[PDB]
Amino acid sequence: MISGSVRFLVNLESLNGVESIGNLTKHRTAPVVLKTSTGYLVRYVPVISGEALAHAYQASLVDIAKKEGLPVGSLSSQYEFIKFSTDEALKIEGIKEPKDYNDARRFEVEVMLKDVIADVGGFMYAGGAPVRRTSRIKLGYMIPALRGDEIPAQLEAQFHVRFAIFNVEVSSALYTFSFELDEDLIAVPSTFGEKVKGEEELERQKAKRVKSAIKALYSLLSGNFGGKRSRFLPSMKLMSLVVTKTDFPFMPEPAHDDDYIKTTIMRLGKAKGVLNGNLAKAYVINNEGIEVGEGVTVLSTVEDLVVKLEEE
Amino acid sequence: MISGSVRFLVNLESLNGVESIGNLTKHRTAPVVLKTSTGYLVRYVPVISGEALAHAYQASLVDIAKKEGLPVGSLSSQYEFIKFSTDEALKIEGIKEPKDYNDARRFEVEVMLKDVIADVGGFMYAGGAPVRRTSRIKLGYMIPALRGDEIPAQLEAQFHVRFSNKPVAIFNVEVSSALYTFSFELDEDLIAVPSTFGEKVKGEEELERQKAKRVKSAIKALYSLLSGNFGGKRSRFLPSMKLMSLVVTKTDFPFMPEPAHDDDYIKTTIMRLGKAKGVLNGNLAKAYVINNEGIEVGEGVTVLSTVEDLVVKLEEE
Amino acid sequence: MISGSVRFLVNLESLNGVESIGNLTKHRTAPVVLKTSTGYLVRYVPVISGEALAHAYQASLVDIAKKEGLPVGSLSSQYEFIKFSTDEALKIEGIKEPKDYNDARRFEVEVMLKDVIADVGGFMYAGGAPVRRTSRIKLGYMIPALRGDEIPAQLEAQFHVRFSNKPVAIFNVEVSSALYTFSFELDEDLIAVPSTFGEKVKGEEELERQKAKRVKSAIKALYSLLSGNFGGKRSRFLPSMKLMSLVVTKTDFPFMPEPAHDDDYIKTTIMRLGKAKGVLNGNLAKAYVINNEGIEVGEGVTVLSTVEDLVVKLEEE
Amino acid sequence: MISGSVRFLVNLESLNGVESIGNLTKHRTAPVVLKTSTGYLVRYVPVISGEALAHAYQASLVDIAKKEGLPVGSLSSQYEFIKFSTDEALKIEGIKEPKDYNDARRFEVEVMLKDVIADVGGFMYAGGAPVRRTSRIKLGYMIPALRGDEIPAQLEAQFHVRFSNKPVAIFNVEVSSALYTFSFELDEDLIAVPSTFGEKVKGEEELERQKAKRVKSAIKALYSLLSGNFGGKRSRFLPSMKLMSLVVTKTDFPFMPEPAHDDDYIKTTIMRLGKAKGVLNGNLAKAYVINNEGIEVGEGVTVLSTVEDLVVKLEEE
Amino acid sequence: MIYSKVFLKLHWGFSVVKPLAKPGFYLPPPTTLIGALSYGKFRGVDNINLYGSPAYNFRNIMATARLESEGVYTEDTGKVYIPNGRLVVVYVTISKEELEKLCWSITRIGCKECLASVENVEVGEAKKVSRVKTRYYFRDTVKVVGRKEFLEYVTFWENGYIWGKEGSPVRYILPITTYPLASKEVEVEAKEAYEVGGEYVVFS
Amino acid sequence: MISGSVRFLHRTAPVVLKTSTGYLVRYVPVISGEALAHAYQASLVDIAKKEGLPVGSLSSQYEFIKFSTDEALKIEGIKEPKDYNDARRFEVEVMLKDVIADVGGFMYAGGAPVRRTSRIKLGYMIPALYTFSFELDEDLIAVPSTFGEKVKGEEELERQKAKRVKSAIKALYSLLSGVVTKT
DNA sequence: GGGTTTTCCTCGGA
RNA sequence: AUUGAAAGUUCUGUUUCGAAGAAAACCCGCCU
């Protein structure tokens, strides 16, 4: 599995919106519990949901799959990720509904043979024979770092008129988030049953699907996910990034504290010792000059990280 | 027995859900009685059930048992922990039903010789000759700390929509933040030991041979709970979790550590452990402390840094 | 006699259950009459029976007796407290039934020479010559404090489901939070002493020799109740328990301490104890107080810190 | 004499059972009619009989007399208050039956010198020459207070189970919570005085010597009743009793205070006590009041705090 | 004929048990009423040679009583429950001092657990008349108006204070409703009746 | 994709700035990007009028309401859409008359909403001396963003695509005057 | 212009 | 001092064992 944590610095941004009141457009906010020298406090800070991140990742995956030559569904070529959820989508795409439990496997294989998105990002179909497939990429809310006693975030409103008057909420924060991607189950059915004709093509295309899934992380690591990008282009830059490639489950430390790379490396080594693993590699990109450790590979950009992940 | 208490800080999480109304998905909430300077009050706070913790522990135990080589049941290889409860499960696995009380021991031994989960996590069979086996791991609800006068927890709802090109798709999700605390207990002196009274039955020699491996696997399985891979809705609501304080006691006599509600629950636990060892005529009592929030601990207590070291020390001793 | 009252704060607990309806498991509830500024009212509150407390105390006594070396009955080594009530139990243990009234004493002595539980916790045999022995430990229902006008207790229901791969599994569990209070009494001056009137019977010398050990074991068994290992559903609903206030009185004359309903029940108990010692011409009266909620106690009263110290002091004196 | 009226508050109690049906033990209840605007409502309210109170008082008096060195009958020391009623009891004790009417007094005093309870408790020997004696303490039924338009009393059933490992263990207990009140009289002036008319018989000087100690013990025995040491099923169902209000009159003429069924019963009894003293030419009339529920009192009374001071002042005067 | 009226409270009730299964009487016989008065003068003596009950000389104090509330009859030993209720007693016969001094001291109507109480009294002089409206119970031969719907027949005793001797059987009509217990008025045309304080009394 | 960054040498907004001591929250004057968008579109109109590129009637005056409201459609004479299939036609029916709606995007809300996101993306101005960045998608000028069957009129757009992309490239000079990368 | 879609609602010993 | 006097229906007992509300989804499209 490929896990990682990353920090971002975003200034003058409006990337996620909520229902508006009057002529004021609101930025999403959420509560957080933070520990200070005086105890524990509850505060309100702007946040960005992970749905936008998933949508951007899936769109980039569609683009890369179409460029390479992998099959893409009809409703997925247009950027509408309804997937094979309702009867209308199946009718448009042209796939019969499952008859019972025993046929479900076949259905899943067919769904995996037409759209890569339903294979990597998972899908759900509700009906007489519901079919589920959990996403192989996991994301979370983008939260400002809960470090020290003062949260490095701010939110205000701005005034605009048309030459007819409205207000727009604008926020600045130091966002941090982590991701996980298990590449050992891509193009592998998750429904229990018997062998079904057509899996040979899946086995042949597994390498291409894995390569495309690895390449698709460039969209998330570069920062093309948010909306309102036409007139509120955020200013983004990279500060710190840690990526771990393992053969056993492992979760890196969150980016709340300044010391989360060396702790992650030590925990990774000790967990490899404990769980009898066979592969554990770490990659670190550092630009803010924090402590890292010794005997760890250091990179300079993100494209090198993507290339190294692809090659290994 | 190995007992322990632990604190967690969780932010922007939806890990346990309840029945939804309309287009709103609800987070589990429960009442609590809290003591303030003005008396006693009743409040409502988000909580997380212990069923998810048990499910995660059992899944990790299945994975470790399959990797090591211990037997795993047919219905347990697939992550469906129905165990040997209904007749369909026995028919699928291939184990005959108990005939009467005297045969119960045999049944239990056979069930313990095929699935490690039915041995560590306990099992129940209802019928003409009911058979019970209590779980060797005990857990509880994950509760925000009831400290001081203000509860450090919050719950709200968030708005989400689905994009479409031909409008003809809106939902709400409850999200909570809290400082969770919970405690656990695991008696390793009864693993691979039948709990049904009777006579000796052939096949216990294999159980005696495999007792060490089963104990090692059970101890190793706690890493999943102590690391924090238990909750659901993990695809798009990946919680941010970190460790604050942890105390583990290994004893030969029953003992319950102090809950993590108050800032001073480590030093009290150590003193109580020493006095209880003196009272109950014990022979072994060891304590391990992991501290990151800088609270008082005491003197003459082993201090660790991570959780893997704790797992290694528990395995070795 | 050793009497006492004690407070507990319990949150997210399901320790006593009643008959279930549908897929809902119910928590025990009982009515209470409470006095407010507007008069008298009747309310319903969750309660915990004393049978579970007695069972936990007796199980701990069995464990301690077996560890020390005191005799324990065959059906009592297995935690089944039917005692010598039915003919099947006597047949299994191997004790003849009483012939008439004059023989009854002998029977009791034999029952006291094989099982400590039948001596401390009492027993009953029904038949041609019924034999009775009242328990030397007395307990009661665990009730939330009836203080002020608002009861600090709450009860709700929680939703649970079982995962499956072929949907063809839903239940509800009642969970309560409360500030429980209860009191206990234990007369240690009648342990290992027959309560049936008659004549001297051979075998009482062993009882006289073992009286000190039996008294020590009975005193030590209170640690289970004072620590809080009594309730059921402990595998997945581990309650969070803590101590708030505790008063224990050791006397040579009958005396009942004030219940823990009101904030002022320690100083009142001490004053009543002094005046009762003066009235009844007593010779020994000692009080022990454990305080954590910062209420008024008084002056010239011994103050402790934990429960193990209380157990040690009770044993030594 | 001495008279008293007391108001109690009891919760979660089973102190007086009745005939059991099936696996259910039932409580004792009495019918009362409550007046309503529409009409009348017949209701059943839990009550406690006075026989249990008499038994508790007699047992406490037996213990106190034995501790103080006074004659106690052989059968009365075994907590068997059969009293010198039939011929077998006298044969065991060693007292000669009365010869004729003129010697009946000779019998009575003799019985008064072998069993103190045969004087305060009173005896009734049957036979060809019956002898009579009246208890020197009169107690009434413990009944809830019919105050206002509501009755603060309840009665529920509780379901209990016995555990076993070889099922082949279900019972029900009735529990109540009410607001009890009761009244009593004590005529100490008639203690140790023979109650059969005739000529004096040798053996009264020792009674004259013992009068002071017997009166003191009889007054001391009220502490047990006023402290709540009566009833059954106290081993597992220990009630939580409390004191609300109490009025006690010490006089020299016959008198009975008003019942505590109205919200104001201290003022009116004071007024009628004054009127009765004026009518009957009384020189001794003192009032003792304990108030916890904050009801109106009046003037001309002495305010006490606890029950011990009441007994002290009863002994002094 | 002088007379005295008295009002009474009852803590829980009275439980007089029928003589000769233990049924109970609906309303106490006058024997209890006169024993409660004799308690004032003969305290301390439980047996005096006549042997028999000490109240063997108070057999000429004719007096009656009635209820003034709502009560219930129970069998759980027949008993009557009327807590916090009222009971009015009229003594009509020794001089005024005897009645007004024994009457202010009235305790324990019935059994030892059947505690009674005295509220207030008054004294006066009675008058004898022979059509009057009454409430108190009377004998059997007394004649009632044309309607007869709320009368109960009971057996009572006269000369039975001496223990070991059987009381005389006499029928007495109580104007009472059986369930719930209450008292109902009845105009009487008889030969021997007495008026006392407005509330008329019928004797024979 | 034409992109780059530009440097030059009252409304205020917060910023999260980084110093040697760590992180701080400060307040600095800012300028909104809508003003730059208006200036860029005005210069685009001025440049387009120099050639045969069509210019909207309402957009002839410097009032960039585009075709948001029905009043603009009525004063410019373009029919409202009937169904979803007609959308592409409507799109070309408003791309064949104005170059601003094509480049900078437009919308029409109603029974059959029509959307076209901007091909030019801009942001706020923050002092470093001001610095900012831009983004220009050179591959989707005159390309119908709506999906559906081909409709008459696409040939004219294909003919004018070169002139339109030339105008889009040239129009950046207004913001450049007051580092570039191209693929 | 959209403000939610299925799927299971306890099994037994006294 | 009353069909009144004398009378505890009291003793022994866990509702216990076990089971994730889980998978799918952009408030985004122009305005000095």
Using DSSP's 3-state secondary structure scheme, residue D277 falls into: helix
Extract the tokens encoding C287: 């009080």
Minimal CA–CA distance to A212: which of A52, A71, A33, A44? Answer: A71
Minimal CA–CA distance to E10: which of E146, E110, E101, E92? Answer: E110
CA-CA distance, B88 to B93, in Å (whole number)?
9
Residue C268: closest C-alpha in chain D:
D306
D88 Cβ contact list (under 8 Å, min separation 6): none
Which sequence spans correspond to the domains of chain F? 31-124+135-178
Do residues F132 and F113 touch, judged by C-beta distance below 8 A? no
With distances taken from each CA to the C1' atom of nucleotide H14, the closest residue turns out to be: C52
Using DSSP's 3-state secondary structure scheme, residue B88 falls into: helix
CA-CA distance, E126 to E132, in Å (whole number)?
15
Do residues C266 and C248 touch, judged by C-beta distance below 8 A? no
CATH of the domain at E136: 3.30.70.3120
Contact yes or no for B234 and A273 at CB 8 A: no
Question: Residue type at D50?
Answer: G
B interface with D, Cβ–Cβ < 8 A, is 101, 130, 197
Q: Which helix (H) or strand (E) holds A286?
A: strand A280-286
Q: Could you give the C-alpha distances from A249 to A275, B69, B229, B312, in angstroms and in order?
A: 9, 19, 9, 17
Strands (DSSP E) found in chain C:
2-13, 24-25, 29-36, 39-46, 123-125, 131-133, 137-138, 143-144, 153-161, 170-186, 240-251, 285-291, 302-303
Nearest by CB to residue C152, choosing from B28, B40, B276, is B40
Question: Residue type at B177?
Answer: S
Where helices occur in chain E by DSSP H, the ranges are 30-38, 96-103
Distance of E9 CA from H1 C1′ (whole Å): 20
CA-CA distance, A103 to A72, in Å (whole number)?
23
What positions of strand H are covered by protein, i.e. any atom < 7 Å from a CB?
Answer: 1-32
DSSP-derived pairing of the beta strands B154-161 and F12-19: unpaired
Do residues E99 and E2 touch, judged by C-beta distance below 8 A? yes
Q: Which residue has the tokens 């039932």?
A: D26
C202 Cβ contact list (under 8 Å, min separation 6): none
> Which residues on neighbouring strands pair with residue B46, listed in sequence order?
B29
C219 Cβ contact list (under 8 Å, min separation 6): C2, C188, C311, C314, C315
CA-CA distance, A177 to A240, in Å (whole number)?
11
| CA geometry: angle C296, C297, C299, nearest 5 deg | 120
Contact yes or no for D31 and E81 at CB 8 A: yes
Minimal CA–CA distance to E154: which of E44, E65, E23? Answer: E23
Those of residues 109-168 in F touching chain B at CB distance below 8 A are: 113, 147
Rounded to a whole number of angstroms, the distance from the CA of C242 to the nearest CA of chain D is 22
Do residues C107 and C172 touch, judged by C-beta distance below 8 A? no
Q: Judge D/A contact: 3 or more CB pairs < 8 A.
A: no
Nucleotide lying nearest to C172, CA to C1' measure: G9
Residue E48: closest C-alpha in chain D:
D197
Distance of E104 CA from G14 C1′ (whole Å): 63
CA-CA distance, D50 to D141, in Å (whole number)?
5
CA-CA distance, D45 to D176, in Å (whole number)?
9
Nucleotide lying nearest to D25, CA to C1' measure: H9
Query: For chain D, what's the residue count?
Result: 317
Contact yes or no for D240 and C143 at CB 8 A: yes
Using DSSP's 3-state secondary structure scheme, residue C99 falls into: coil
Which chain D residues are within 8 Å of B101, Cβ to Cβ? 166
Chosen for mutation from E51, E86, E181 (greatest number of chain D CBs closer than 10 Å) is E51
CA-CA distance, C252 to A147, in Å (whole number)?
62
DSSP D188: G
DSSP A283: E
Where helices occur in F99-150 by DSSP H, the ranges are 100-104
CA-CA distance, D64 to D61, in Å (whole number)?
5
Which chain F residues are within 8 Å of B165, Cβ to Cβ? 147
Q: Judge F/A contact: 3 or more CB pairs < 8 A.
A: yes
The count of structural domains within chain E is: 1
Minimal CA–CA distance to A235: which of F137, F126, F36, F38? Answer: F126
Do residues B123 and B135 touch, judged by C-beta distance below 8 A? no
Phi, psi of B156 (to 5 degrees): -145, -175
> Exposure string (b/e) for D76-112, b if CB count within 10 Å is 16 or more?
beeeebebbeeeebbeebebeebeeeeebbbbbbbbb
Distance of C126 CA from H12 C1′ (whole Å): 10
Where helices occur in chain C by DSSP H, the ranges are 50-68, 74-77, 87-93, 101-112, 117-120, 204-220, 222-227, 267-280, 307-316
CA-CA distance, C22 to C20, in Å (whole number)?
7
Do residues C278 and C37 touch, judged by C-beta distance below 8 A? no
Q: Which residue has the tokens 């002839």?
A: F60
CA-CA distance, B2 to B287, in Å (whole number)?
10
Which chain F residues are within 8 Å of A234, Cβ to Cβ? 123
Minimal CA–CA distance to F109: which of F64, F56, F149, F73? Answer: F73
Extract the tokens encoding D208: 């004259």
Residue E80 lies in domain: 2-202
Q: Which residue has the tokens 């971002």?
A: A8
The torsion region of residue A206 among left (phi > 0), alpha (psi -120 to 50) and beta comes to: alpha
DSSP C48: B
Do residues C116 and C214 touch, judged by C-beta distance below 8 A? yes
Question: Residue type at C195?
Answer: S
CA within 13 Å, CB half, C143: 29
SS3 track for A219-253 = HHHHCCCCCCCCCCCCEEEEEEEEEEEECCCCCCC
With distances taken from each CA to the C1' atom of nucleotide H13, the closest residue turns out to be: D162
Rounded to a whole number of angstroms, the distance from the CA of A233 to the nearest CA of chain F is 4
Interface contacts D/E by beta carbons within 8 Å = 115
Which sequence spans correspond to the domains of chain D? 2-166+170-316
CA-CA distance, B181 to B317, in Å (whole number)?
26
Rounded to a whole number of angstroms, the distance from the CA of A192 to the nearest CA of chain C is 9
Q: How far is CA F20 from the centre of its chain?
A: 40
CA-CA distance, D262 to D268, in Å (whole number)?
10
Q: Judge C/B contact: 3 or more CB pairs < 8 A.
A: yes
Extract the tokens encoding A299: 């990179």
DSSP-derived pairing of the beta strands A297-298 and A280-286: parallel
| CA geometry: angle B181, A31, B225, nearest 5 deg | 30
CA-CA distance, E141 to E159, in Å (whole number)?
20
What technique determined this structure?
A: cryo-EM
CA-CA distance, D251 to D273, in Å (whole number)?
9
Minimal CA–CA distance to B142: which of B27, B34, B46? Answer: B46
Strands (DSSP E) found in C28-167:
29-36, 39-46, 123-125, 131-133, 137-138, 143-144, 153-161
Nearest-10 Cα torsion for A193, A196, A202, A204: 120
